């Protein structure tokens, strides 16, 4: 995770360049745990598989500081 | 269970990060010695039996 090559999943970047040309579709079933959020991802909706059930989330413009896997929870905590 | 994991090891993985080690007769992976490639159980066994070359017992 150096300056040299901020990491992209790159099996997802190929699937999002077809989306941003014309009118976007509102689902990409993916895993996206490895990749970061850079401004070629805004608007699109990803169903991030948290191990159990793929959770939809769409990308805002304040999301560029963080990466894509940090959103779908895997704990299932609520409990006490 | 055991020989599936032995078969998983000896094939070449996709990644050098996986780089997984076990023993040649001990099924366990979890106590290897990379000069001996033996588990701690049988290395205790075949050094008492002397099948390994020169290795004293103890009491330096």
């Amino acid at each position: 995770s150096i300056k040299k090559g901020p990491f992209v999943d790159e099996h997802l970047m190929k699937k999002v360049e077809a989306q941003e040309g014309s009118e976007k579709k509102q689902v990409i079933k993916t895993w996206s745990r490895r990749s970061t959020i850079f401004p070629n991802f805004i608007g699109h909706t990803f169903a991030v598989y948290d191990g159990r059930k793929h959770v939809p989330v769409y990308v805002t413009e304040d999301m560029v500081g963080h990466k894509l896997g940090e959103f779908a929870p895997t704990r299932t905590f609520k409990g006490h | 269970a055991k020989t599936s994991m032995v078969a998983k090891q000896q094939k070449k993985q996709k990644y050098a990060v996986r780089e997984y080690t076990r023993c040649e007769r001990c099924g366990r992976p979890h106590s290897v010695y990379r000069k001996f490639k033996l588990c701690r159980i049988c290395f205790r066994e075949l050094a008492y039996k002397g099948q390994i070359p020169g290795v004293r017992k103890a009491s330096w």
Partner: protein
């Protein structure tokens, strides 16, 4: 108590090695070729009165010495089976040159033989206490000094395991002078595994 095995005290102190080679670089992989041909020699011989083997390696002429309490059976008929062994032993490794065999007198005073031949007196399931006493009474008759042997589990055919040892003679397990030799066999009786230890001296 937790008696450790009597060979492990004495390897190099009052004994020598069952493998006497050296390899600084690539010590790991060509150590595995030893217990390849420690399994493999123990496969097709299949109690040809084999006590133990020795391995020595020098300049891709790697030696194997076997003791063979019944000599000639590994040799065959005038160098037949000894040449029929190097037809496979030289294929499992590269060279396996200068395969040979020496002989031993007193066929059942080496403890590897003494444990094995009365462990094979357990698949016929006949009188384990005499199977003990056959080994003790013959021992110092043939020239031994101290004898000690036991059988551990599923003793006699019952449910609860019971050790059962018989002894006489000087068996100094704590004295580092002593040439104690032990062995452990894996006699199955189709209701579990019986374990049998022996202890010979001189």
């Amino acid at each position: 108590g937790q008696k450790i095995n009597p060979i492990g005290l004495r390897v190099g102190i009052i004994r020598d090695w069952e493998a006497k080679w050296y390899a600084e670089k690539d010590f790991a992989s060509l150590l595995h070729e030893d217990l390849k041909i420690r399994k493999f020699i123990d496969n097709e011989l299949k109690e040809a009165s084999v006590s133990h083997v020795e391995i020595e390696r020098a300049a891709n002429r790697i030696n194997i010495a076997i003791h063979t309490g019944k000599p000639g059976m590994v040799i065959g008929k005038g160098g037949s089976e000894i040449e029929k062994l190097r037809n496979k032993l030289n294929a499992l490794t590269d060279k396996k040159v200068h395969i040979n065999v020496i002989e031993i007198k007193k066929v059942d005073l080496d403890a590897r033989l003494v444990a094995e031949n009365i462990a094979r007196q357990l698949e016929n399931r006949a009188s384990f206490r005499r199977v003990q006493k056959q080994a003790i009474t013959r021992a110092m008759k043939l020239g031994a000094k101290g004898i000690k042997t036991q059988v551990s589990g599923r003793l006699g055919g019952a449910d609860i395991a019971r050790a059962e040892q018989y002894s006489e003679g000087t068996v100094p397990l704590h004295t580092l002078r002593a040439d104690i030799d032990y062995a452990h066999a894996e006699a199955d009786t189709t209701y579990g595994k019986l374990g049998v230890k022996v202890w010979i001296y001189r």
